Amino acid sequence: PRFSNKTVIITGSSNGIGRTTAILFAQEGANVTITGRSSERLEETRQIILKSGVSEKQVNSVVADVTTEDGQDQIINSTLKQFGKIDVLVNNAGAAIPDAFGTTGTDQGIDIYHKTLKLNLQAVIEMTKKVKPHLVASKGEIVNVSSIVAGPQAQPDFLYYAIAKAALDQYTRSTAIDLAKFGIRVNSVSPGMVETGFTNAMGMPDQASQKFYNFMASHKECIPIGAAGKPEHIANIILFLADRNLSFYILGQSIVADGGTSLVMGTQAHD
Amino acid sequence: PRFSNKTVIITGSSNGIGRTTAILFAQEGANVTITGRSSERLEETRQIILKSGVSEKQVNSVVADVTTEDGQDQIINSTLKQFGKIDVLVNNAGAAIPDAFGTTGTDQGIDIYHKTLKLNLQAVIEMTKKVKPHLVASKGEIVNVSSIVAGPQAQPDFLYYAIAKAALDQYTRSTAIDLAKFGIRVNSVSPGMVETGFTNAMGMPDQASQKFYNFMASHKECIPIGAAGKPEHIANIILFLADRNLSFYILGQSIVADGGTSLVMGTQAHDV
Amino acid sequence: PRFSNKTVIITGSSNGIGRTTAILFAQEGANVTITGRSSERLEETRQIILKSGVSEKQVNSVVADVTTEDGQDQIINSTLKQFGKIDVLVNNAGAAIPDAFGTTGTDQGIDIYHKTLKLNLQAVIEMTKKVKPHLVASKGEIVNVSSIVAGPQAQPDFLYYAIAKAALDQYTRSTAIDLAKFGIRVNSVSPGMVETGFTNAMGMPDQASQKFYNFMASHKECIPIGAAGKPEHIANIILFLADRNLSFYILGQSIVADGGTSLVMGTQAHD
Amino acid sequence: PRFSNKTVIITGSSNGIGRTTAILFAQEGANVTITGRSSERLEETRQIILKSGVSEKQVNSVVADVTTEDGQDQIINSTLKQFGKIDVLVNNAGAAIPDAFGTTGTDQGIDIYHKTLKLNLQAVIEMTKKVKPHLVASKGEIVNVSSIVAGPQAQPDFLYYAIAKAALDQYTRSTAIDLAKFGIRVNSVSPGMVETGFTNAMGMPDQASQKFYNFMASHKECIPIGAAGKPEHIANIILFLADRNLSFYILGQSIVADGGTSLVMGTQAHD
């Protein structure tokens, strides 16, 4: 009942963090617009929600590319058409786009740059501007999903993904102050490693990804808390930030949720 | 129900943030140890909890000075003797101790340096060390209360209070990493302006304080969100951080809750 | 001459910080490539250098748009053609591109987003990629010019300029670590208000600009040090970071030089 | 002669960074006050100064505990007595005080806390307040020496040394803004690993320290620059910060000089 009568758009909800976030919002009694590119996985999210006893009248699934004008327009229009308003936008869609040759570092082509920023930054900007007037009317909120790769530590392998998130953080802070005069609250969450479809999207096989998780989780210099992040761990923070009654006074912040990963220095990997 | 069968110590719970935090914890089913020096205000906190349907056996009221070895031991020891364990420690007690001659800035006397750090930093460190063995056994948690005055912006008026909170943020981060090996979770919250007994404690008349709150709340360059912070605003965050089930993956962080105050540059108080 | 036998590329040297930086480098025995779009102002810079005791053979002038592939290529290649190498690159060109209709905040159009990042971010990335093999050979350095607008405080007016600089800082940190293995040192400077052609490029009249400078310099909550920044103030820091013998151990850092501006909170403008 | 006719007090100049800093200031024609507890090593610095060609009339040696009202009074008294004024104060003295049983982590005793802050924080505060009236007259400067251990990364072993430095950074920022009204410039430098007497002071055998330096320098995740810091590396920065003509616009900042150490994440130590 936390979000009863609230319409929430969750980008990237056809998998990972976005999927679980939409599921929680739904269970919380909210109208949810779930979206992604893979029709099969998007429906899977829809099914998880229906099996919850939640009506399909409270769910709007949209197959679209969030980096295209038409895709963005479809997400916004279908939500208003089915719900008549927008209370919260969660810019969750994102990915570390790899090169065709697994190239990392300064050598990554400018094409990777363009593709990564278009998704991890530009889309966030366009969705924000398009939902803006609707949030002004509903005195709504925005919750962006960033990453500790934004900084303050260097990220020398997937540099464009890193700088796009760094730009995201200042975009979150800046629109938060700008939109605050209209009663809107903009915040963010910067996850550390979380088990989702992220690594698979990068080209990592399921078995290699599992090996990645176990190593990270079992070494304290990697993840101090000793456990791999799970989708719910981030979804919980997103809902908290969207619950004005609870997180009200937090504004323009991106909460780091990384089990302590960003607090450990490279030298500390050695005794 | 969120904190049923959980024992929480809330330092500085005889007023402001600590009072409301203690109240919310009790309403959430927790055994709570409330403490402070003013016996009159501490009892007020207790009454509010009792007149909520909370049994007196779920409350441990302790009058003590958290800056002394004896006061610290009493807080922890009475909690163990009353509830049998400690699940959460919220280091909330703190204050911007004023200069006896009203001096601010670099000129503030060294005596104020000692009193300020002993309260806003040393007490937190000693309570952490003293509750540690019990939190190891319960795989509990710690939530400290810092302030945006810790940085990154400069604080030229009450410098000792500021550096004390700056030191505290690194203590939070460092004990979070050191204690994580025991299944413990240390986090913090850094509030902006919140209406409590803080300004009064500083010697400000309630009339001046109200004018301060109203002015800060009405000027977007001061508090962007447009409203003064309330004790509950910070209490909700502390409970959230104490709720391992919900906030689990957040570790060694001090969430800024200031309505945007710290995001505003001085130059931005003026229009182009 | 502490920069003798050193060849330096100074982007955006037809005006402001870049012009002064080029002057000082040349003044200290360096081969310098100056570049910009306004040939008249670019020639202005060359004459100042020449007016000294510097021979025209130590100065290479390139009229080019640093945002285009061709412009970027002309700058690098003419530098290699005339001097035979590249020891340090200073990514100074940058500008807060205004909306033709004066819009600010979240409302600024996507066209401004594209133009702002293309110059303040993309150009830096491409110049870096393009000079890399030569910096690897000379074990040279890179000095980027950022801005305090990058963060940690919000910038609700010229958001895109702000986020491009925030991304720039993480690009500086990340390339510093990636390129450190090659003996290269990447650093940066984040200026506060500086009297240059910056406000003019934005469209501000000279009278308004001087009025802006005076107000900032005379109000401690704006500029604590009590004086407007000057081109030379930023140039001195660039040279210091480019001077490996002196600043060697500084790596992946962007020194803030703002007379204390970023250290003052909005509330402190009252007290 | 960059600092000719300028009087500089360099605390902790009987070894490491302070020694080298005092030496450079002296070579630059500055009146210097070198202080420490070990008269032997203190005189060693003095000797290095005189052998540089500097007259001992511009050298004031002082043996004193910088943590006592007396020691600091003596440092300041002899400085004014022999020089009549004070232009710059460098708060360099500091150290990581070990537990009687090598105890580390949260368990370090309160005794360690007291000793650590008294030297690393309190002394800086006291020297700052005591030189203040003299810097106001001379529109002088202050340069403190902090450490990357102050944050943003956690320091779980010597917690007290870390929080004292973190407090130092906010003290630097705050006194800089406060003292700026008098034309005084306060800044700082935050070193990464530098080969000095630091480790020995901790109780580490010289052979072990060498093993430590070699290991740190040879591991990219430890020191990306590939070389251990040298006292000269930090001294260079201190003098830069003291040279108002050059570093003028930098105010209330602590320049990180760690060869990139603080930029590497714990996970990045693994492939």
Ligand SMILES: NC(=O)C1=CN([C@@H]2O[C@H](COP(=O)(O)OP(=O)(O)OC[C@H]3O[C@@H](n4cnc5c(N)ncnc54)[C@H](OP(=O)(O)O)[C@@H]3O)[C@@H](O)[C@H]2O)C=CC1
């Ligand atoms: N996993 C981790 O460790 C971390 C993740 N993050 C952030 O989490 C988000 C990614 O989610 P998880 O984290 O859940 O990742 P996956 O689980 O990788 O989820 C990717 C999600 O975004 C969508 N998406 C990607 N590209 C597009 C596109 N062009 N158009 C529409 N939708 C798109 C996917 O749609 P579908 O596949 O159909 O396309 C899917 O729902 C990003 O913002 C990422 O940076 C931050 C830090 C760490």
Ligand SMILES: NC(=O)C1=CN([C@@H]2O[C@H](COP(=O)(O)OP(=O)(O)OC[C@H]3O[C@@H](n4cnc5c(N)ncnc54)[C@H](OP(=O)(O)O)[C@@H]3O)[C@@H](O)[C@H]2O)C=CC1
């Ligand atoms: N109010 C604001 O705008 C902000 C407050 N904060 C933080 O909030 C905390 C203060 O609470 P509010 O903020 O609620 O302040 P008051 O409402 O000022 O609460 C002070 C609390 O701490 C206790 N306390 C102070 N000194 C001691 C001492 N020596 N021994 C034991 N208890 C002591 C008080 O006990 P009783 O009076 O008996 O002594 C009381 O419960 C501090 O940690 C402060 O830095 C951070 C940022 C902003």
Ligand SMILES: NC(=O)C1=CN([C@@H]2O[C@H](COP(=O)(O)OP(=O)(O)OC[C@H]3O[C@@H](n4cnc5c(N)ncnc54)[C@H](OP(=O)(O)O)[C@@H]3O)[C@@H](O)[C@H]2O)C=CC1
């Ligand atoms: N002035 C201030 O207060 C601050 C400035 N900065 C940074 O300083 C830099 C700007 O210099 P000042 O600061 O000296 O500014 P101006 O003095 O504004 O200098 C702009 C410089 O960059 C060049 N430039 C702009 N766009 C292009 C382009 N498409 N192709 C080639 N050159 C281009 C100009 O060339 P010409 O005009 O021919 O085109 C000129 O040399 C930026 O990186 C800016 O963000 C950061 C903070 C504050």
Ligand SMILES: NC(=O)C1=CN([C@@H]2O[C@H](COP(=O)(O)OP(=O)(O)OC[C@H]3O[C@@H](n4cnc5c(N)ncnc54)[C@H](OP(=O)(O)O)[C@@H]3O)[C@@H](O)[C@H]2O)C=CC1
């Ligand atoms: N070495 C490293 O890797 C790093 C060092 N630092 C900082 O450098 C400083 C220490 O110098 P180095 O770094 O050169 O260390 P040593 O080379 O360890 O120098 C210690 C210096 O400070 C003095 N000192 C220490 N305690 C006292 C005291 N109670 N009274 C008077 N003087 C005292 C010493 O005097 P003498 O022994 O007579 O007493 C000596 O000149 C500290 O500020 C430290 O935090 C920061 C980061 C890294």
